[PDB]
Amino acid sequence: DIVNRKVEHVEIAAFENVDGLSSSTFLNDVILVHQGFPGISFSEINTKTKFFRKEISVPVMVTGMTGGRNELGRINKIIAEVAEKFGIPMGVGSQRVAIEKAEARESFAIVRKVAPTIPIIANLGMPQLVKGYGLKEFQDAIQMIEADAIAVHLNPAQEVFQPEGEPEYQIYALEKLRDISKELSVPIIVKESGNGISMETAKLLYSYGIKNFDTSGQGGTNWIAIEMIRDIRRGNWKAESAKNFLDWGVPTAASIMEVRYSVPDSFLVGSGGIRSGLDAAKAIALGADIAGMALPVLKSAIEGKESLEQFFRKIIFELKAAMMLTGSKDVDALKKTSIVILGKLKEWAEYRGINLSIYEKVRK
Amino acid sequence: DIVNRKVEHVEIAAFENVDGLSSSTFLNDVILVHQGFPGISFSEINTKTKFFRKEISVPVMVTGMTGGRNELGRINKIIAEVAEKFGIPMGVGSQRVAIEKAEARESFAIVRKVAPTIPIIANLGMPQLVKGYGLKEFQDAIQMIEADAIAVHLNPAQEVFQPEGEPEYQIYALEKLRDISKELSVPIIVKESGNGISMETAKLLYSYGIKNFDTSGQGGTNWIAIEMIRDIRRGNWKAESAKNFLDWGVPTAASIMEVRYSVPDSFLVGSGGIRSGLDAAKAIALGADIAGMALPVLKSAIEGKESLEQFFRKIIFELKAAMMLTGSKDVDALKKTSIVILGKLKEWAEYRGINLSIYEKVRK
Amino acid sequence: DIVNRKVEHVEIAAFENVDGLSSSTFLNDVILVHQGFPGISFSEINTKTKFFRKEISVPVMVTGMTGGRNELGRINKIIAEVAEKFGIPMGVGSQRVAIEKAEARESFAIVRKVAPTIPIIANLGMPQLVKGYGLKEFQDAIQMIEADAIAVHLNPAQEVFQPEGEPEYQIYALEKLRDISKELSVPIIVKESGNGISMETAKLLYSYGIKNFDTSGQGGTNWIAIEMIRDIRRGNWKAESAKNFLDWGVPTAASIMEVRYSVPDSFLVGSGGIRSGLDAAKAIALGADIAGMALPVLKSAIEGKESLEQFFRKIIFELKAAMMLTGSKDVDALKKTSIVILGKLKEWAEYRGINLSIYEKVRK
Amino acid sequence: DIVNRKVEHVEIAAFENVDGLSSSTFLNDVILVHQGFPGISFSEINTKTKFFRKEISVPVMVTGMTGGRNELGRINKIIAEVAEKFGIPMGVGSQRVAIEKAEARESFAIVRKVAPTIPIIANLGMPQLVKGYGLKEFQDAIQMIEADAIAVHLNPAQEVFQPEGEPEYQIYALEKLRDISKELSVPIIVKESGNGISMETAKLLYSYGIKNFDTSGQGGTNWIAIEMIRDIRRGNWKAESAKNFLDWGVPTAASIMEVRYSVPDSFLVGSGGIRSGLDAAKAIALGADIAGMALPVLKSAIEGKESLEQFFRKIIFELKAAMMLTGSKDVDALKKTSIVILGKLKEWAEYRGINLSIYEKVRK
């Protein structure tokens, strides 16, 4: 019933009120400057971009979500087969459960069966690095789905409020991670889980050789909220404490700036409450290399394959519309299109010593 | 039934909820400084100003709206005959439909019949320049109403979400436009359609010899909203994507600043959600040479001639009041009266590198 | 029935919704810094201050309001006899009506009968200076109540929307005013009427020898609103235009700054929506020499003598509390106590080039 | 029935609507930067800190509240015995009543009986120093509970609106306080009472040798509100005046900055509307040495011992969570962890000349 937590996560995320609960992406404060004369035609817009060694159709990825059981695997199947069809990369949920129990291995292995060509991304938790995971468990997760990269997740917020949570993040784990990167065939992405990557955390990770980040800021799926609900449900007293932390974290937009600024040469996924292609566009324009999505993908896949195919169409169209309307012929042009940064995001950046002049240069 | 789109545009704009829907002019953030001692009498205020080669009574124009059918032409008739009476210039709707079908030619030609002296402004769409329009179609549109100028419209936003939309804006079209200006007897205005002119777009247009701009920013008629409604109505899936773009664009006030700043010597109409003579006053004060109106004129003309005559009286009075209360004896004095720029418009201008010092100089 | 407008003004102001209607003082944005150790006792706080040649008990005045009829004069009687008792100066309403009709002379003359010692301030409208008033009409108004000063009022906003309004403010009127000051035995105050004095207006007035100003900014009695109501009532079409100007003007707080800054050595009444002793305190602290009130005094006087005596007690106490809690032993100490300027007032001051450094110096 | 005021204070504070009534801590504007990789384990977080000569378990204190009667003493008993159990320091309510009546001495003396080891802090009012309290009354208060320090309270705000209030704060009282510190065996803390310490007040107190401050800013228990309620209840006319001052004071967060900045080397309690361990965390991070609480401790103690034990667990956990999620191994690390200062708090600090650069340095 670490597999029970797995179904509870999906069940709450999908059907309960946790999307952006008391949180904010700050994407509100980002405005793409409209170009009344785009200088391009809609049909010649090229959404292709690179994702490590492969090429992907759209600068969007599905980030890690689930696995560890049947109904969980058949979700992963729906996601993967559609992701394949659209040429967009897919992460899988934490593979811990598949390392601990061989029955859960199938619900992850299905992904590569049904999606042979797209980038697939493994997933293990940072806490497990403190609790005696090493080179072989990583290679396990990797070869189990023939992953093109592995995502190690940061979730100290969640672990703290989780009823069975493991809030251990000793510096030792980074020495280990860095050694494991020596021996690994594929690159590592470090990703948060709804609470965002600060420039301190980015710089630290970078100092240990981490080059790929996934922001996962607040404003999307509220993981403190999900554990709060699990806490309420067990009459665990932590529930009320969690309530005080519902807006803890770096908002996604702020995280994107923070990471891009503190480690310019990084490969950067901008995720955490990306809900439309416009949001994807803003995130990329703001500094991300690719935009990441979880929850809305889950909600669609639960409704069935074509429901999700319609979702990706809507996202892709939206993105292309933002590109069109900024005169951005391809992903590179979008990355350097004109933006306005307003309100709280501005105040944030200024206080954190993010120089708006030198920032415009770093993003391009 | 490109004529059907023409009636549907009028029918939605006039009777459905699209005026400023999730959009904003930012005119809110503009404050005309009250002068307790004006230094003038109300009766000596002179609202006269030049409009290319003619002189107009008020620094206000009715911008292009409709034509292509009977009930559409009898609207144009009401507008034009009232515009004439008040000595205010009038643009007509897109003349594409009249180029394609000779029956629609009457609904445009009526305008010059009933309004012999005021500036009348022709209208063709930018996409048509990529789709084989040229010198002769322009001269057609012009001589068809004995136009004093022709407005070429930017509507990539609209075209994108339009169900039958043509979102093609290749750079070629500007090379063509620039050549057509060589041969044309009247000047060209480039205008947007509810989404605004950025300083990048202004500068580009200017580099092709365009000197007359009509901002048409967001915060008035929401053209994305109108197409969304047409999409909902056809059960076209684009409807929901459109919903995400309802606040896409440059707000009018911001656009005025952007144009005036990036191309100081421009002749500049400030339009997009101008609803009162106070709005007109702000737009002029802010940097516009003349203020532009569409939707409220439509709504009045639909109610009848005198309903619209009362409207122009209200607008004029309001304008004169703002002039009086700023001690502005004439349109020139208004253009350099004292203002305050606040809130989001300030943040916008700062981020976009609009120097408030050097701006005050350019508008004065 | 210029006497009828007099009754209607009181009747609307007193019983209808016009106090701060869509307007704002910006006093919100002014904060008096609390001193946990004041350094004084409440009982030793000295509220005394000078008012031209006289001394007054409190740095507060009742500004001009009414007269011209019986029920209007018996209001002036209640106000005056209470003002006398409290040693606070009182302005009277416009004396135009008393110049035009000798029956109205009594409703003004009563004031000096019942208030022999306090400063009484005469009142005439600026428009009348263009319409043939001069030295003798001024001396009339003065000697009619043995005034210690005369207030000439600026009301171009009001006159514009007034149904029988006279919006004439030629520069000639200042040449005349300046000559009339030559021959007058008492000083002149120029005051606005709900719409505030800008720094341009202040400077202009100053260049004609005017040294005493009464801000009367927006956020209090909305005089555009009052005339709008009169308009609605006569089915006058101006009603709707007025509605668009409901928030026209300089907010009181801004006006105080603007005047103090542009003419440092001025004697300055801060009025326009002063509703509590805290408001009075903020206004003085901000830069006013004395605080001015109209509407709330009217409303109390209408309820009877003791109702108004209780009002002045409440005001005085409130003021003293603010003085106590800022460690301000007397009016001078309050004028230089510590403040915070926030929000929109700050943005206003910055845009209008009011240097916050050099401002803090000027207000001391 | 100065003991009646004691019962009324508790009875209103506890059961009526006065917590943060029209007031604000500004803690909203303080954001602790989330660290996705903390670099520590939750279990190795050390919350210990020094409190004068003693060491305390948590950087939190219960600030002074009550005493003077039986049901008041049995509250003090519950608080103290729990405070003891958790190793957190406790202040007692004003000991005036125990100096005046020997029956009230028991309700204070109980505290040291049931809490032998924790720091206990005496309490006397600043007004009593002008009304002939001296060395011996201080030593009385101290030895009556074997206090480790004495808090003298600033409450001019309260005294002003109190029906039986004594608003006397002559400078003389500081000369006296300073002399009394000569002869006293324990240190003196100066604390406010819901209205905050300004940098002027801090500097003044410091110039008289005061080194320990307790901010007690607005946004928590509204003492003006409490006296307002007492006023309403006695039909005292001051009630309405009080209403106008409900948001008078320095917001806690602002006060913390102001004190830390004006007197860097101070020992500083940050109190006034601290309601969660997150609030405690923010206050310490911001500049406080320890966080202070009153009202929520009262409310729990009223419900019984274990209700309050649960409360302290909740607070401690919350605090440790904030520490964890900022990678703060101990109280010192938290004091120098990364923050963002936004909105009104930023505007406040800027206007008050608090240099954000030189501030970041002072807080570490």
Ligand SMILES: Cc1cc2nc3c(=O)[nH]c(=O)nc-3n(C[C@H](O)[C@H](O)[C@H](O)COP(=O)(O)O)c2cc1C
């Ligand atoms: C049901 C669900 C389970 C998830 N589980 C995982 C996990 O196993 N590992 C992980 O790194 N991310 C996990 N995520 C977090 C996402 O990858 C993502 O970083 C975060 O939810 C923010 O994106 P969103 O707001 O678009 O969902 C999960 C999200 C959802 C909705």
Ligand SMILES: Cc1cc2nc3c(=O)[nH]c(=O)nc-3n(C[C@H](O)[C@H](O)[C@H](O)COP(=O)(O)O)c2cc1C
């Ligand atoms: C019913 C209607 C039809 C319009 N059609 C056209 C068009 O043919 N060509 C064009 O350049 N502008 C067109 N406009 C846009 C206006 O000229 C104007 O730029 C825009 O609506 C913003 O102004 P408003 O908010 O005052 O309406 C149309 C507006 C309306 C309301």
Ligand SMILES: Cc1cc2nc3c(=O)[nH]c(=O)nc-3n(C[C@H](O)[C@H](O)[C@H](O)COP(=O)(O)O)c2cc1C
């Ligand atoms: C009923 C009434 C009549 C007034 N008439 C006059 C007038 O005769 N002359 C004048 O200078 N001010 C006049 N005032 C304006 C006030 O002196 C004051 O400047 C303005 O009302 C703002 O103050 P308040 O908001 O505290 O009323 C009048 C105000 C009221 C309420």
Ligand SMILES: Cc1cc2nc3c(=O)[nH]c(=O)nc-3n(C[C@H](O)[C@H](O)[C@H](O)COP(=O)(O)O)c2cc1C
């Ligand atoms: C019932 C009650 C009585 C209090 N009485 C005292 C007092 O005797 N002396 C004092 O210095 N502080 C007194 N306080 C004020 C607190 O010590 C504290 O400074 C203030 O309430 C702000 O903290 P809070 O918002 O956490 O309650 C009292 C607070 C409460 C709730």
Ligand code: DMA
């Ligand atoms: C958002 C996120 C990281 C979800 C997985 O949490 P978990 O603690 O259930 O993962 P694991 O199975 O690694 O404990």
Ligand code: DMA
């Ligand atoms: C606001 C605006 C430009 C309306 C005309 O759009 P359209 O696409 O119907 O014009 P055309 O007839 O040129 O296609």
Ligand code: DMA
């Ligand atoms: C607020 C104010 C100035 C009221 C008097 O206006 P008015 O135009 O009735 O005065 P007058 O009697 O001078 O015309």
Ligand code: DMA
């Ligand atoms: C918040 C606070 C200081 C409460 C005690 O006030 P009080 O005036 O009842 O105290 P004392 O007993 O010293 O008069």
Ligand SMILES: [Mg+2]
């Ligand atoms: Mg886990």
Ligand SMILES: [Mg+2]
């Ligand atoms: Mg078109």
Ligand SMILES: [Mg+2]
């Ligand atoms: Mg008049």
Ligand SMILES: [Mg+2]
């Ligand atoms: Mg007391």
